Design a protein around this ligand. Structure first.
Ligand SMILES: C=C/C(=N\Cc1c(COP(=O)(O)O)cnc(C)c1O)C(=O)O
Ligand SMILES: C=C/C(=N\Cc1c(COP(=O)(O)O)cnc(C)c1O)C(=O)O
Lengths: 427, 428
């Protein structure tokens, strides 16, 4: 099947012949009993594929991994306990002390802090690029570079990168392109592997889960980056491995080498694993991902038209807008809806934004995106609080910005909620 | 304020909320927590007010799990993680950075040894291993870049018990904390290392704490007893203006809670190895019977060691309650509520015999875990310690003839009977 709406219900699971359970069971088990002692030794020796221990694999999580990989067009995936952990495990596999990665400066505030503050005390530095220009990405690469890292639509100014031009630069220098596709809704709005991304990461907490119940992340491997070809930057992908008695990953696993290392090195030793309970919550969300993402983007388009005519709004920021700075990229890469987000500024002083948010009765003020319920937050004092004012500006965040995650409520009710709040704030 | 472990494991850290009056701990399957207003959200994010923000960082179900474990161990506070490995990783990553080292015992669970010997050096954090257990070797390995001494309260799978008070004395005299993995101490039932000088205790909650083999999880417990200010030369991030929080000075704001606070507002926030509330609820169900289970585990282990000691089919028994145990003097001193839930044996004959004995068991399960209510057996040489070199396995007490047994709470006569019938089959 290659329709998204079909894969999100069927990919990665067949009822086992023992129980024939139609729905995916929740394998609430830490462990898996060996057939015999020799079988256990083959499992720990990576000589036979099979369930060993839920810090590394779990059959509920396996369905979640296979289904997200199918939706994104990757070969395989690995779940983590959060979007933050998905990014951390990915960079930790590609880079070590003395390496760097090149990243867009337009990031979720928590990713910016991860790259700018946390990773450097492990020896891993980031060179940020603000302009989006191909030549500035090229000029930032040096011999210690291990990836280019961008968000598919930055949180919360919705910069769409030139995926194909950046992938070309990355690949000419022998480094992978890593894309955080959280705001791409599990591949529905944007499938970065189709435009050159080698590795895709998600906070599954957001549109993938869809209901604000569960934290989770996932790492998708395209299988398309020839590590052996570029083993001067990635020796651990081909050289004998100190943690598996000289196993050579590329020779053993080929295009699955990166995602194999994520599991047998990083999940095994860092241990940021996903619960099967969490995975089942996320699978329920995935079963309607296409439907929700479609309605989200329809409501977002309609709500932006309302905001564009509202005398109470000073500006609307929406990647579907012909005024958007990267509208030419949005137009090329987003052909199934221009996302589920918009940001606005409202008229008046510094006080006005908080007054409009606080007066909403349907929209919830909290930290999340991609709930079925509509959400609002002030990134300058929350999601991007840890950044300096200059860093906020380099990420498109300003003191007057209100970030809106548009839900699937009836759009007349969303609009009516803003209307009554505007009339309490302004008359 | 309660005295007894048995009472704390049911009541510490939870009072029914007055909205619902729910007697049992609810499962807060929520990513987020709605602000009262915009200014409230700003105070939460600015760390100006205590309150729920987002479940990568805090969650009310996980919070009960955390407080209850802290109360059982005698710490001021705890932070849950997605696994025992993650509890270790986040702890060392807070204390140390690239260019630093820690000193650790060489008697470790194989996954920890590989974490310290292979993973962390990639981040420029190296470990100096001490094989002897002697106080003077721990002292000698400390240099100016050392950031901790790390030991298991009873090592997996040879059950070395460390001289807690002597090692703690060395650590504190050099201005570094003592970090103890108390996994095999069963949540503080068998051993409470904070009472003996440990500054920080980590657990795999996957084991006796959860007790049913359903759930992976970890937890970090801060004693609150290490003075980060006295030793800001080795730990400047504990006192110096913080780049994550606009110059916040942690010690000056949080005092004895500084380490556990950084674990949350730096490591869980940016590494994100959080525990789900569904997992915390499974673990809370286990904790409600931890003292009862640990008591029966140890009672069954004592009786099973008696059985193996009189069996013609056993070459040796390894049990920290044995007067022949290399660290029996430390076990007797620090284990006064039962000598653990574990033993290891070697069986007579050639190399294939341990394998046939385990394969012949029909009640005991051959799998990777410890601290299930069900009895378990495994061959660590080819499993839990498979990643280590042979010399590294010896230095951790693992032999090729070792069978590790996690003794369950089944009726001990059924456990003995299972080994007996498997012994006839293997040996006639
Ligand atoms: C409250 C968190 C928010 N965003 C999280 C996020 C993450 C991290 O994922 P988690 O660790 O939270 O699962 C990664 N990438 C992007 C694009 C993100 O927006 C938000 O509301 O802005
Ligand atoms: C299958 C795993 C086993 N042990 C795990 C373990 C860990 C890691 O914790 P998790 O990441 O597994 O929660 C930490 N410390 C000790 C002492 C441990 O024994 C085992 O069966 O030997």
């Amino acid at each position: 099947f290659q329709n998204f709406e079909t894969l999100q219900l069927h990919a990665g699971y067949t009822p086992d012949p023992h129980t024939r359970s139609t729905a995916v069971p929740i394998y609430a088990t830490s462990s898996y009993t060996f057939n015999d002692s020799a079988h256990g030794a083959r499992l720990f020796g990576l000589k036979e594929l099979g369930n060993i221990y839920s810090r590394l694999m779990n059959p509920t999580v396996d369905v979640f991994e296979k289904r997200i990989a199918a939706l994104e067009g990757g070969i395989a995936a690995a779940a983590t306990s959060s979007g933050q952990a998905a990014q951390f495990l990915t960079i930790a596999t590609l880079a070590k002390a003395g390496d760097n990665i090149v990243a867009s400066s337009h990031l979720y505030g928590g990713t910016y802090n991860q790259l700018n503050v946390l990773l450097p005390r492990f020896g891993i530095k980031t060179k940020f690029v603000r302009s989006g220009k191909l030549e500035d990405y090229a000029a930032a690469i040096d011999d210690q570079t291990r990836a280019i890292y961008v968000e598919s639509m930055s949180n919360p100014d919705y910069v769409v990168p030139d995926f194909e031009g950046i992938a070309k630069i990355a690949h000419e220098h022998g480094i992978p392109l890593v894309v955080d596709n959280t705001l791409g809704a599990g591949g529905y709005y944007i499938r970065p592997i189709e435009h050159g991304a080698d590795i895709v990461v998600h906070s599954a907490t957001k549109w993938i889960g869809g209901h604000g119940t569960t934290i989770g992340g996932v790492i998708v491997d395209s299988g398309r980056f020839n590590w052996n070809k570029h083993s001067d930057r990635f020796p651990e992908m081909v050289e004998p491995s100190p943690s598996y008695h000289g196993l050579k990953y590329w020779e053993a696993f080929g295009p699955a080498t990166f995602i194999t290392r994520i599991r047998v090195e990083m999940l095994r030793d860092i241990g940021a694993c996903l619960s099967p309970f969490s995975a089942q919550q996320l699978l329920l969300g995935i079963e309607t991902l296409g439907l929700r993402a479609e309605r989200h983007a329809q409501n977002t388009e309609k709500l932006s038209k309302y905001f564009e005519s509202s005398p109470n709004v000073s500006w609307v920021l929406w990647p579907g807008s012909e005024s958007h700075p990267t509208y030419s990229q949005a137009k090329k890469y987003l052909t199934r809806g221009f996302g589920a987000m918009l940001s606005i500024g409202v008229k008046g002083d510094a006080s006005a934004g908080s007054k409009v948010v606080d007066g909403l009765k349907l929209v919830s003020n909290l930290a999340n995106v991609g709930d079925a319920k509509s959400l609002a937050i002030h990134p300058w004092s929350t999601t991007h609080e840890q950044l300096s004012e200059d860093e906020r500006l380099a990420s498109g965040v300003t003191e007057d910005m209100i970030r809106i995650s548009v839900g699937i409520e009836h759009v007349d009710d969303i609009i009516a909620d803003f209307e009554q709040s505007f009339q309490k704030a302004y008359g």
